[PDB]
Structures are given as structure tokens and as C-alpha cells.
């Protein structure tokens, strides 16, 4: 609060030139209490788009402090000072289109500050779009067929044999831990094509739910969706491929908007750009272990050091230690050599509530996936590369920001390793012990705002 008073002005000036806005500012700076006194000044009303519900509700309890009418998702909304939602309200063409529509009774994004939050997030916006196919499915809808069959009583002998074959091809798909693209699939022919349509469509007149699923209308999409087709784990997974055109298309609005993030990442690029980057960020004692790494194929080998380190940071530590892992895979292969040692992983059967409770009472390794004395970098959380959906994406990126393919992945791995470094320290005072421990962090140093002279080394 040096910084939302200095930078206020600089962020007016660019909005009011047309400009949008990019913020970053570490958790903890109070982002969403800036952009709420941005909308006061701008007179507008405030639209913020989330990721998550649990988000929506910090919102909520920052706006009502502001004495500001507050809510979360139209004719309670329209008088509202603040207005919270996910990303698929601005997103998804269709379910944004709903919501703001051009009708009396809709709310107009023209009247709103529009704030995409966490906003690193669009790095991945590929995944918001993608359809996928699975035998499960199938299956499913085979017996939605044949309701209608038994049912309405017509013969789609063309649409089930269509199915079949397709489960049959689907089920020589090599599955191991990923995404393979692939140039094409069995497709329905014109006939089975028209008698998809139609037995989809009696089927959803025998759905007496009014929103109401059905796998033969997700096999219905599939099939007319475009996009770049993969086998990931033996489904079928289709990703559009103009994600670019569609952030910049749901963002075509003309009024102020902001995009921001504690972590927003060099390659989050948008048209007519500004960036606000808030230096203001505590004390992080800062150790770095050379001689080990999480490299994939080097992962095994190294299980046996991360196993004996970890051991030696719980024993010399007097509280809790937060581990963290590239993959719930590794976090698994550690765990098994830490006999001895008090252990705390969360979904196992653990709901955060209770992490915290046992944390006050004793010393835990609290083991998690990418109070207590120290946080745990066990491993880089590098992308998964040989993925063809994490590469295609790393390759969308270059091509639109023009940076070469490394610097997308630095990015990439930059964020999660910020992002986990920021869950746990988020007030200045904090003095948490932070263990590098993967020789790949010599490269994310200066990302980390760290002098090598600080970092002490660790083995």
C-alpha cells in the first residue's frame, strides 16, 4: 500500500489512453483491493473474472470491507458495485453470450472495469476448450441408443455400428502417462451422420431434465468440433486450435480492462498492451541442492538423495517442512524411503482443516504436489515435454510471442515455482527457509529476486 497509491495514476493514464492494463503484484500486495479503488476513479462498475469459487469468496469479503455492494455468480447484480464470476462467463461464446446479452434484461460488459485475475492462467486457455471421447462414454452412449430404440422405436443400426467400430480403434491406442497427437480418426459416414443427429436429439426429448447431458450429444460435438486431435490415455481429446483469436475475441469489448496476476508470466501477451510490474515484494533464507534433480529421466536415480535430504531438513528443522513435487508420481516414490518419519500428504484421505490442526500439535512433513520453518522445492516442476498437447502449446506461445521455445518453458516453470513459493509466505514479516533442491534452480535465481551470494548450498 507504497505501491497502490504511486502506481494509481500510471494505471488511470493507461486505461484512460486505450491501453489494457497488465498488473503483477506478488500475492499478498493486495491486488484486488487496487483494482478496486481503479474502479471507484474510472467510474465504472467492477466485473472480475476468476478461476476458482474459492477466489470469488476472498472478492467478496474485500469489497464489503470497501463498503462496496458486492456479488458472485441479473436484476440483483445490475445495481452491484463489484461483480465476481469464473472464466467461462467471459470465455465460452456461448454461455458468455447468456449472460450478456443484448436485451434490456442483461448486464453490458461496456459498463464494467473488466479484471481478468490470475491472469497466467490463459497460458493454458487450450485446456478450456478441448472435448474429449472415452470408451466409458461410448458405452454410455449405446444404451442412450438404445432407450430410444426401445423407446421411440427406430433403427440406428448405422450410428451403433459407427460407435463400435470407433470403440473398437480406440481400443489399440497405445496408454501410458500422456498425449499423443494423431492426424485422424474414424469419422461417421453422410448416413450415420444424419442418424447421430436424430437419435441424439429424441434422446434429449427423452432427457426430462431441461440442462441435461448426454453422451451422444458429446460424440455429436466431437465429431463437428475442429481442432488438433490427441490420444491422451486411450481418449480421444480434440483442442481448437485459434485459442489466441479467442482470448483476444471474448476481450473485444471497448471499455477499461485488466489483466493481472502475482505471478504474470512474459509470455501472457495481448494486443495494445500495457504492463505494471509492483517491485514491492520478504525474507526468504534461500538454500540450493546442486547434486540432485527431478530431470525425468534422470528422476529414478535421484529418488534414493531427495529421500536422505529430506530426512536430514526434518531432523535439523524444529517445525513443520512443506515438501513439494513436480508429480504425485514422485511425491508416491519419496514417500515410500521417509519410514520414521511423522508424514502428512493431503487428498490421502486428509482435508486441509485437518493438515493444520496436526501441524500446531507436532512436526510434519507435509508433502504436497506442484506453522512450519521451511518450504521444499523437491524438484523442478518442469512441463512434460514429450506430451504432445503441453508441446503444442509451448509452440503456440513462441509463435505468438516470438520468443524461442526455451524461454516459454523457462516461463512456464517460473510461474509454478513462484506461485508454490507464494502459498507460503504472504506477509512481509514472514522468515521462511526455502530449499532449491534441484540444480536446474541455478537458471530461476534471478527470477526469484535472489543474489547468488545469499544462497547458501546444500548436500
Known amino acids: 500500500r507504497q505501491w497502490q497509491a504511486e502506481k494509481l495514476g500510471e494505471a488511470i493514464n493507461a486505461l484512460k489512453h486505450g491501453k489494457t492494463l497488465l498488473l503483477n503484484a506478488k500475492p499478498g500486495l493486495g491486488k484486488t483491493v487496487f483494482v478496486e479503488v481503479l474502479g471507484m476513479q474510472l467510474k465504472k462498475k467492477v466485473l472480475i473474472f476468476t478461476r476458482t469459487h474459492s477466489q470469488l469468496d476472498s472478492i467478496y469479503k474485500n469489497a464489503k470491507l470497501l463498503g462496496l455492494k458486492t456479488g458472485f455468480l441479473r436484476a440483483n447484480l445490475k445495481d452491484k458495485d463489484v461483480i465476481a464470476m469464473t472464466y467461462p462467463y467471459l470465455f465460452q461464446k456461448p454461455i458468455r453470450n447468456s449472460v450478456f446479452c443484448n436485451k434490456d434484461d442483461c448486464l453490458k460488459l461496456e459498463d464494467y472495469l473488466i479484471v481478468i485475475d490470475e491472469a497466467h492462467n490463459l497460458l493454458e486457455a487450450d485446456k478450456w476448450f478441448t472435448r474429449k471421447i472415452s470408451r466409458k462414454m461410448l458405452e454410455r452412449a449405446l444404451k442412450e441408443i438404445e432407450i430410444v430404440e426401445r423407446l421411440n422405436r427406430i433403427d440406428a443400426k448405422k450410428v451403433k455400428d459407427y460407435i463400435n ?15 499423443h497427437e494423431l492426424s485422424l480418426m474414424p469419422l461417421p459416414d453422410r448416413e450415420t451422420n444424419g442418424e447421430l443427429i436424430v437419435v441424439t436429439r429424441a434422446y434429449l426429448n427423452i432427457d426430462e431434465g431441461p440442462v441435461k447431458k ?10 463437428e468440433m475442429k481442432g488438433d486431435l490427441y490420444n491422451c490415455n486411450g481418449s480421444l481429446v480434440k483442442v481448437p486450435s485459434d485459442v489466441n483469436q479467442l482470448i ?5 469489448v471497448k471499455t477499461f480492462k485488466v489483466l493481472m496476476s502475482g505471478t504474470l508470466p512474459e509470455s501472457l501477451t495481448l494486443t495494445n498492451s500495457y504492463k505494471i510490474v509492483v517491485n ?6 534461500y538454500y540450493y541442492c546442486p547434486n540432485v534433480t527431478s530431470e525425468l529421466r534422470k528422476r529414478n536415480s535421484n529418488i534414493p538423495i531427495y529421500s ?22 514422485m511425491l508416491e516414490s519419496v514417500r515410500i524411503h521417509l519410514s520414521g518419519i511423522p508424514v502428512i500428504e493431503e487428498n490421502k484421505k486428509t482435508r486441509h482443516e485437518e493438515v493444520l490442526e496436526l501441524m500446531k500439535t507436532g512436526k510434519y512433513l507435509v508433502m504436497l504436489v506442484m506453522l512450519f520453518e521451511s518450504l521444499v522445492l523437491a524438484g523442478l516442476p518442469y512441463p512434460n515435454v514429450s506430451d504432445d498437447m503441453v508441446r ?27 506461485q508454490t513459493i507464494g502459498r507460503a ?13 534441484d540444480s536446474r534452480y ?3 535465481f534471478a527470477d526469484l529476486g535472489i543474489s547468488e551470494k545469499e544462497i547458501k548450498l546444500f548436500a
Not at 448426454?214 to 465429431?223: A, D, I, P, Q, R
Not at 514491492?280 to 533464507?285: A, D, K, T, V
Not at 536422505?308 to 517445525?319: G, M, P, T
Open 248 to 252: 483476444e475475441d471474448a476481450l473485444n
Open 214 to 223: 448426454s453422451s451422444l450429444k458429446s460424440l455429436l460435438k466431437f465429431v
Open 392 to 418: 503444442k502449446r509451448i509452440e503456440r506461445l513462441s509463435k505468438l510471442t516470438g520468443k524461442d521455445e526455451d524461454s516459454i518453458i523457462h516461463d512456464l516453470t517460473a510461474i509454478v515455482i513462484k
Open 280 to 285: 514491492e515484494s520478504g525474507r526468504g533464507e
Open 442 to 444: 541455478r537458471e530461476y
Open 425 to 437: 509466505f504472504r506477509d512481509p514479516n514472514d522468515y521462511v527457509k526455502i530449499y532449491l533442491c
Open 165 to 179: 467400430l470407433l470403440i473398437d480403434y480406440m481400443s489399440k491406442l497405445i496408454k501410458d502417462g500422456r498425449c
Open 308 to 329: 536422505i535430504l529430506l530426512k536430514r531438513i526434518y531432523e535439523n528443522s524444529s517445525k513443520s517442512v512443506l515438501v513439494f513435487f513436480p508429480s504425485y508420481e
